[PDB]
Amino acid sequence: EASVSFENGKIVVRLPITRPTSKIAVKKIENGVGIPVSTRKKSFPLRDYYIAWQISYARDGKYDYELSRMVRLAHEHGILTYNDIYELLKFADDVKSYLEDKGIRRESTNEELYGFNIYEDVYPVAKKELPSGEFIGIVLKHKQRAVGYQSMVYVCIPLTNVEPSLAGRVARRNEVVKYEVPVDLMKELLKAFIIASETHKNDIVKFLRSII
Amino acid sequence: EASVSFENGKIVVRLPITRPTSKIAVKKIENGVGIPVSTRKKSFPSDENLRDYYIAWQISYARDGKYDYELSRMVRLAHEHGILTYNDIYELLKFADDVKSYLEDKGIRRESTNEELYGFNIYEDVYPVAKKELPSGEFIGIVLKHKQRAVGYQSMVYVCIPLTNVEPSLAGRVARRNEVVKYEVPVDLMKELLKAFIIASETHKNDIVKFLRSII
Amino acid sequence: EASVSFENGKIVVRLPITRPTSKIAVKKIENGVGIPVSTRKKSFPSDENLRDYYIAWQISYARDGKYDYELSRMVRLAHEHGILTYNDIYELLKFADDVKSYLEDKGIRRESTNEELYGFNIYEDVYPVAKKELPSGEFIGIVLKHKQRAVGYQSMVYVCIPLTNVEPSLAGRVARRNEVVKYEVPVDLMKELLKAFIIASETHKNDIVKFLRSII
Amino acid sequence: EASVSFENGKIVVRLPITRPTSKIAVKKIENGVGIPVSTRKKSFPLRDYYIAWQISYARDGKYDYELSRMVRLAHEHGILTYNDIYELLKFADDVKSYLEDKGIRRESTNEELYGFNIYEDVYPVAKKELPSGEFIGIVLKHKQRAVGYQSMVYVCIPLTNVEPSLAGRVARRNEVVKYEVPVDLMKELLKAFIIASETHKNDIVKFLRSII
DNA sequence: GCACTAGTTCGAACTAGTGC
DNA sequence: GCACTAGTTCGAACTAGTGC
């Protein structure tokens, strides 16, 4: 439900902010944790607020969706040079372990709760912050209905970096905002998928080699 | 769904072995340690490996607002028949009086590390788990989940029942289509499952205390 | 879910009025005729229009293979308490002996017409519906649905309960959040719902006869 | 999950036949009724067997999907002339009532079943058969979760009209077949949507006027 | 606000495909 | 064939948007 385009020499994405889903939701960040927010009820003050986007690179087996759509448009308009794709391919070739390798572990402690021993389940999370304010997250979740893991990639875009400014008001009905996607972001998201798992890497490599 | 009955002086539960769901599924817990791993095995071994298989049951005490379901039906039947005594219930009410802190109070924390994965900073999200093991091999566990639409945590209680503890014996056997097995519920398991709910959250404790008071 | 109980000499069912589902929902049946139409009205009128509103309940007699659910719980409680007499049950068993044809036997037919809609030939698919009305206004209906994965038909039994027949009176009232209303189940309704299942399919009849035999 | 393309001067669709869904399923036809079939278990003999395709013309608000994709490709390659689009627009302008207008009615009868009165619920169905063997169906279903109706358009494509011939064998795993879409079919499907309802018509009209 | 319509998440139940 | 993985339909429960 995201809309990717090329406008004014810039890759832009238009994102809805009032219909929260697994894929797109506005969050308030406190101590790392992302509190959900309803953008229609409470008014905005702002550095605390992000669009949380679980971004994809394929759909129906097609690599012309969200991230891959942004990349194709960038490469065709010289935002993403052949040089950039080469080094991302080099990065990928150098990557030998993944977030999925780390897995999820259960550790004993020396604590009890009224006679019950306390253990801690430890989930790995990979994160990078761009100087522009965007966050990239890679979370490991226990694969639904199946053994093993799924790695999920998120981009977190501060409300201060979108237009129009939501400052001082509730979102309008079906409000959609526009975000100019910086080349750095596309690079780092491709890198995130590369390290998320070997199967995500193999996909990204085939796609970028596809851009030739 | 499980089916709970009173038979021959015991509380008995009949459990599906083959149609795994979030409520009831066979899981592998290797040497009784680690996160339970899901499985769809229908043929069970007859050596040391059998002891790694459990029925994992995310067990409840109410359904549709009524307390005649799974654990509450076990307990009401156990007390009706003198399996769970008045004294047993008074001891559990006393335990609940003493509990003033809960698994949900611990919540979930994110820890920074010093590792980087190819330039990306690594953090660790840390979930508290409460767990107790009975002498006969059953595990009672309490874990947390983020609430679906809210800012809080939901606590869930599980009992993990060794396949070596059910009938007909699964050792070296392949489960039939829609196989259901029979498990005699030990009184101490009912006690510990009540205690699990009592320490899971204040709301769960309040529910359990009102329920126990009502069966007296 | 409905909640069925014995109170003050009557079988009583408590029914949700506000969270419509395929099982239980408020529907408008204008002057008691036509296909029921779904609605999410929370404010109910106090004139002739009130009589067009019903609670439509797709009612069952078993859940999880057990016969202690909705209609079977009504009937077992009714018989325990002498509301539904032995003689009543013998009359229903006699009725079932006489039934040798079922709504499912009728099936669904496609009829050709002579109409065309801008060049396209018009056909009509025709579904049989069995329906009975009680003197106090309740409807008992039986309809067919194509089976989800099979070549057959599934029969479903519905009771449509006038809102004017429940408590607290809904006339000129707005339903509260998660409102539940109270309905006293007439013995003749229990009889006719059993008869409905008996004529719906041979399988349903067999189920009902075995159930009735078991409560004797 | 259908794949539309332009090959050899013909619009072709590639359809899977072993993963039956609401949208695509293989059926055996007897006395009008469409029996479902599992193409992997039982071997094929053949005029009795059709691919039943609940075809669409939009997706995510985009009119580049299934039917609309076929039409766009046809018009761009001269299979569907401007003349064809004009007359389809004329057809549409002439259409003043719809399948949805007919609704679904409950009729009394003089029959009883062991004391219960029998009524008949009557559902309208629109159908056309091409000389090539394809059927087009419009069925009225009681709109899920809502008042009123939904009209659904189906194309039924005989297995004798696809390649390869399934004669004498079970389908292979993930077997997909290719069907060359005749211009007549695209015309008649557009006509089906036009008469299905006024809202389907308004959509189709805006789309064809969009092709200009 | 009422009375919807439409969009979503979640779990149960089912089926086809995959690798050993 | 076993032991999964992945694709689907269906209903319950919830939320945002719409027209009056």
Numbering used by the authors:
A (entry chain B), D (entry chain B): 8 to 52, 57 to 223
B (entry chain A), C (entry chain A): 8 to 223
From the paper:
R.PabI is a type II restriction enzyme from the hyperthermophilic archaea Pyrococcus abyssi and belongs to the HALFPIPE superfamily. R.PabI recognizes the 5′-GTAC-3′ sequence and cleaves the N-glycosidic bond of the adenine in the recognition sequence. The structural analysis of R.PabI showed that R.PabI forms a dimer and possesses a characteristic highly curved β sheet, called the half-pipe structure, at the protomer-protomer interface. The N-glycosidic bond of the flipped adenine is cleaved by R.PabI by hydrolysis, similarly to DNA glycosylases.
In this study, we determined the crystal structure of R.PabI in complex with 20 base pairs of dsDNA, not containing the R.PabI recognition sequence, to uncover how R.PabI interacts with nonspecific dsDNA. To determine the R.PabI-nonspecific dsDNA complex structure, we utilized the R32A E63A double mutant of R.PabI, which contains residues 8-226. In this study, we determined the structure of R.PabI in complex with 20 bp of dsDNA at 1.9 Å resolution. The asymmetric unit of the crystal contains one R.PabI dimer (protomers A and B), one single-stranded DNA (ssDNA, chain C), and 162 water molecules. The R.PabI-ssDNA complex observed in the asymmetric unit forms a tetrameric R.PabI structure with a symmetrically related complex generated by the crystallographic two-fold axis (R.PabI protomers A’ and B’ and ssDNA strand C’). In the tetrameric structure, the 20 bp dsDNA is sandwiched by the half-pipe regions of two R.PabI dimers. Although the contact surface area between the two protomers is small (the contact surface areas between the A-A’ and B-B’ interfaces are 201.1 Å2 and 102.8 Å2, respectively), the two R.PabI dimers are connected by four salt bridges between the protomers. The interface area between the R.PabI dimer and the dsDNA in the nonspecific complex is 1156 Å2, which is approximately half of the interface area in the specific complex (2166 Å2). In the R.PabI-nonspecific dsDNA complex structure, the dsDNA is recognized by 24 hydrogen bonds between the DNA and each R.PabI dimer. The structure of dsDNA between the two R.PabI dimers is slightly bent by ~20o at its middle region due to these R.PabI-nonspecific dsDNA interactions.
